[PDB]
Design an enzyme around this catalytic site. Structure first.
Site, short mmCIF file in Angstrom:
data_model
loop_
_atom_site.label_atom_id
_atom_site.label_comp_id
_atom_site.label_asym_id
_atom_site.label_seq_id
_atom_site.Cartn_x
_atom_site.Cartn_y
_atom_site.Cartn_z
N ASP A 189 -7.94 -3.20 4.81
CA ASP A 189 -8.30 -2.54 3.56
C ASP A 189 -9.66 -3.05 3.05
O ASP A 189 -10.48 -2.28 2.56
CB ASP A 189 -7.24 -2.87 2.51
CG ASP A 189 -5.91 -2.21 2.78
OD1 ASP A 189 -5.88 -1.21 3.52
OD2 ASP A 189 -4.89 -2.69 2.24
N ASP A 244 0.83 -1.20 0.00
CA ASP A 244 0.00 0.00 0.00
C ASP A 244 0.87 1.26 0.00
O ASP A 244 1.64 1.50 0.93
CB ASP A 244 -0.90 -0.01 1.25
CG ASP A 244 -1.98 1.06 1.24
OD1 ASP A 244 -1.89 2.01 0.44
OD2 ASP A 244 -2.91 0.95 2.06
N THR A 296 -6.65 0.50 -5.14
CA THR A 296 -5.42 0.58 -5.92
C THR A 296 -4.88 1.99 -5.72
O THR A 296 -5.66 2.89 -5.38
CB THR A 296 -5.64 0.29 -7.41
OG1 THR A 296 -6.56 1.23 -7.98
CG2 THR A 296 -6.16 -1.13 -7.63
N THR A 297 -3.60 2.24 -5.89
CA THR A 297 -3.14 3.62 -5.73
C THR A 297 -3.01 4.30 -7.08
O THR A 297 -2.14 3.97 -7.88
CB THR A 297 -1.80 3.70 -4.98
OG1 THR A 297 -0.84 2.82 -5.59
CG2 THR A 297 -1.97 3.34 -3.51
#
Lengths: 489, 490, 513, 73
Positions: free
Chosen positions: A355, A53, A86-87
């Site tokens: 998450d 993350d 998702t980043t």
């Protein structure tokens, strides 16, 4: 004014460098083919740690003079409100900085260009009405409970080889939470013994402590107690505790702090199991479950105390002598227990389960989602390109740069996948242009495919906050003049 | 062979650096208030070379180790039959290298992107057509004759104040060329004096020489004699041959490409015949087409072997020092233009200005096709290509999208040297073209956008057709070429 | 941001360099004639630590900046499962990187190559149970009990001149242990004297500590006491500090307080009949005089690992403070005595009621190398507990590795190309193991590699690398075999750790918590 | 505003010279416009005090050379 004024070209460059550094590292992270990374540093760190993350590591460190940390700090609110998946939020903001070089060619006041962002707000709103994400997530829901976004959040996480199975488990937990209870009583632990399933779901709460070597091994019809001249005086504390204890039938004592030795001898003979320095978080969560009590002074026993009485025991689930509290009358709150080959990587599974909890709560409540894998992203890019042409005045350059900004996102998803980006970008564009919102980047495929079949969808909050935020973050820095970080100091 | 090792990322950088350095010097030039640059080099150069025209200066020198000369050499071919307008083919190629930074991130195959230039071949072609281009230049044309592309060609040049009038004159020159003649036979020079007109157009060929202070002012029904061999060489006998048969031909003018013996000159004055000492050979060869020619041998040369046009030859005041004009040529195929200037030697600028300006006019008459000027053609094309990039298949589109943004620089460059804000200009312009009005373009005098057609500015169809095809090939061989070392720089 | 960037090939190189540097040191480690590396350090290191076992030395210290320590850390988990034989797993991972030079020539994203590792699980997986293996030991077994893998494990170790005999001895020990669980109650210790046998097998547990010269020589119907807390008393809850007193008087009270601790120990002791006391840590001097008069033998600072094994053996104890005696503690009672048989005097615990636990004693050499035997036997014992439980093993001496190489070459071509370019690179990796095995042998590796492939290609699983001969021979006659567990786990471990580093260019973000 | 300063100065001067007091700078416009329509007006006190104050500011330039302090180092 002080020092480090940075109000023009020398200031813009500092902004420019921070954005490029973050984009390549965050790039491999996105979607199912996201990649696990570690870092090498010296000075009170100990070793190389792997954090899948992006948000977790950025909060942790601030190694150099240049800015990014304030931009990074904002990302937490997005995570608090909706979380992750998702980043991509940081990446999108970083890439529009590149156009600034084009902007010097433009050679006028940066802010007039910035007008594109009110329109950017429009892009968020216009795209949301244009791209039929989903109208599902009815409540509980049969199959759609998971094998969707949680899988995608986890897929970027390496643990997904067996983990995706436990991801599925987490949605079962979220469905029961919803409604009358609140966001309370959720806890997760992992065990050294391992099975193919990798997890067992407990009806109650899992704790890991023991009174001492002596004491009854198992307790039935258990009552639960929670608590918030001198030598003779000590005896008095001993005597009060024994007289109140016998009448209740007290089978277990849980105290959130240090426990005195004198009572301990008594508990063994009495047949009462007590826990030293029990964690407060477990106790509060437990109180909803057992009905709780008012934790005053030793007067606390009997009616002022409420104790559930189904079954409390210390058992062997594989290797460690854990204690299981089970049989909740309330039913509102439950606990999930994880297992998985015992290691540092197993800790990582702990990271992504958190998450999963956060993403699911928002997806049902917001009543909206977006197509993942860049599906929404490429489609929106097709629509915005026309818009740059439509505007007059200074609007066209600003809108234009914004439109091309959307293009990189398809590229980031394909490149992390590793399939050739040139080939990928146009093939992708042709499918979106056609009118199929479902079609997008399939990392597993290596080309483009149907996102809906994958089941990858993103929370509606994640896309609207990022578009407004990424936009705003990029131009605060251009006009900065003397803040926390930038580059030279 | 070669010698300089630079391997992967370092080799790319050398190609990258050459393009950026060239663009800034050429960029100032590309518009109405363009900029003139004067260059001085140490020994091996005499001095004074200042060139407004980018092509002329790049060809002349190889200043340093990095190589740009081979890229430069190619520009001449474009220049010969399409010419110019403003130097810009080199500028567009240079911005292409900026995307290469994106390419390292891409980190796959640098040659793969090359398919984009193949994309460029039909994207540029498709787009030039999916615009409206002039449909004008019927034949001769009153208003549409100029105040057009030539004005744009002039724009780069510092001259454009008095000068835009001069370029107006140039179309008059194309009209006389019009026919099966094609482009040739036009020569023009500058005179040091001050007049509002600043230029004079005369019907024949302009030569600046005189027999001597004595001799008739002008001759009528003139016969022209050209000799390969000099008059310089008993002496009286040479004199006798020259006068006895000169009277016979009725000779009115003699032109010799070399030194001339003094005895003949006394003779010519009394006779009523005007001779020219040391006349340049280049003037002579053109003159022969004009006058029907002759055969230049020994003094037997007069009579039938000599052909001579007969309208009017005279020495006429040009406002300063005397010039001699040949006119009334029967053929009509060849004609001459005379320029006048301040005395700057920034007026040599006119020579390069002239060269690029003249080529454009001849092409416009022969091609019977053109595009709207003032950058009207370039912005509309940019609108069409953005849609095209998403429209096309995988590999082809990423390069195509980058090609599309290249068009953006031309509107900015035209406006930037104008003396107006580029930011307002670029963005305001797109809405006009986007709407569907092809005539609308960059009006530099206005500072905003205006109707190109009223001005009449149009560009030769060939100039748009070949810059795009040529740019693709040259841009393509930079990213994909590693060692690149031959004669000259490197 | 940014933490340690060198840009592309160089980033890859640091990963590359870490693998190459480690391989040369571990290289001498493998095979019948092994080499011992002597390592000396300053600052909290006593003397040169010589460890034949590659895994133990890597764990002890993280000497420098390049990344490789995490790869090293994983190998320990393997050790509990099966671990050793000869150190080889680290070497295979290292050579994987050498194909990276090929990868730049590959001209594609590294991750496509990476799908190859899950595939690699397949490639290596095909090899297991594609290379005969051994049918298995029937149970106990007359001759196949050893003269096998243990000899190979010891091959790497110098003491093999007499040590291989020691190895033969170890399986006899495993026969009694044979898996009713994982592995408990095995203890081995050396002594300072020479004998041809170089070891003896004992029915009970061997320890070597003594209370003092005084105390009765023999104890019977012995009671055993184990205490978590030390006999020592003084520091207490509050120090009282570093005091001093008005001349001499009060200091005497401090002396008096000690006597109460002495008396409690004896009063509780006499009623039980206590014959032996074992404490894991420092012991207090005052009780020592007391034990001698009573006729009770105590052990000072007994090691904890010995104590816990002892507890199942003696029925166990509940260890708490001085209320520890009587019923809360259980004591088995046959005979505990100091007999001495050899050189250095020791104490034997024997005749345990449980019967589950037994102990092995090693002898001979008496130097730096003998001290090695402490970790050498443990390596042998771990393999054996697994061997009966698995019921499956594979041929040793690198027999397994060459056969796999023939199969994997086919695989690269057989699969579609994106998968295909890297199966072969994984495939050529297996080639080095034969080479590493041969190089330490003392014979030429090229010739060795050369003779090896034809035998395996032919179809004989039994045939392998014979280091002693210098040529290729029948592994089965030697009897050397590898446990089944070492092969399935290593393949999975190699798959995850080796190329994730390659697919990543010098890492991205961390330095957290 | 985001508009070129040079262009703005000339255009502004022409409108004031002509005689329209209402006319002023319109930043949204980029040129000049009617200030009153926006409704933008400035308090009388701010204008009278600044002019007298301004004279004092212009009064402290050249007549004063250097001379540094007001607050610790």
């Amino acid at each position: 004014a002080g020092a480090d004024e940075e109000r023009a070209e020398t200031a813009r460059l500092s902004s420019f460098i921070g954005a490029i550094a973050i984009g390549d590292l965050v790039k491999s992270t996105l979607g199912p083919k996201g990649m696990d990374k570690i870092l090498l540093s010296s000075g009170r760190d100990a070793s190389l740690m792997v954090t899948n993350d992006g948000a977790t590591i950025l909060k942790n460190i601030g190694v150099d003079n240049p800015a990014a940390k304030v931009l990074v700090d904002m990302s937490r609110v997005q995570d608090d409100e909706v979380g992750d998946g998702t980043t991509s939020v940081t990446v999108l903001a970083a890439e529009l900085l590149r156009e600034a070089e084009s902007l010097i060619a433009k050679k006028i006041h940066p802010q007039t260009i910035i007008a594109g962002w009110r329109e950017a707000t429009k892009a968020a709103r216009q795209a949301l009405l244009n791209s039929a994400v989903d109208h599902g997530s009815d409540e509980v829901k049969f199959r759609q409970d998971l094998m969707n976004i949680a899988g995608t959040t986890l897929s970027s996480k390496l643990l997904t080889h067996h983990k995706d199975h436990f991801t599925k488990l987490a949605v079962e937990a979220v469905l029961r939470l919803k409604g009358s209870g609140n966001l309370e009583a959720i806890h997760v632990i992992k065990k050294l013994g391992g099975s193919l399933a990798d997890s067992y779901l407990d009806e109650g709460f899992l704790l890991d402590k023991k009174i001492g070597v002596n004491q009854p091994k198992r307790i039935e019809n258990a009552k639960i107690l929670i608590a918030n001249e001198i030598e003779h005086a000590e005896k008095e504390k001993m005597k009060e505790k024994v007289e109140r204890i016998l009448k209740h039938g007290i089978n277990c004592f849980i105290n959130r702090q240090l426990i005195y030795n004198y009572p301990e001898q008594l508990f063994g003979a009495a047949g009462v199991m007590a826990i030293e320095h029990a964690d407060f978080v477990g106790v509060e969560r437990l109180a909803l479950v057992t009905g709780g009590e008012i934790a005053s002074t030793f007067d606390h026993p009997e009616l002022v105390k409420l104790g559930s009485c189904k079954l409390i025991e210390e058992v062997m689930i594989g290797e460690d002598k854990l204690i299981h509290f089970s049989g909740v009358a309330l039913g509102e709150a439950c606990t999930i227990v994880l297992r998985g080959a015992t290691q540092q990587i197993l800790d990582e599974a702990e990271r992504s389960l958190h998450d999963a909890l956060c993403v699911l709560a928002q997806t049902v409540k917001d009543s909206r989602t977006v197509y993942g894998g860049g599906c929404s992203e490429m489609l929106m890019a097709h629509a915005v390109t026309q818009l740059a042409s439509r505007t007059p005045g200074k609007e066209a350059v600003a809108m234009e740069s914004y439109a091309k900004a959307l293009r990189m996102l398809p590229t980031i998803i394909a490149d992390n996948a590793g399939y050739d980006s040139a080939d990928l970008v146009a093939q992708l564009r042709a499918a979106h242009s056609e009118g199929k919102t479902t079609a997008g980047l399939d990392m597993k495929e290596g080309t483009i495919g149907d996102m809906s079949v994958l089941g990858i969808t993103e929370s509606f909050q994640v896309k609207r906050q990022v578009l407004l935020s990424a936009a705003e973050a990029a131009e605060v820095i251009l006009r900065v003049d003397n803040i926390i970080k930038a580059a030279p100091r």
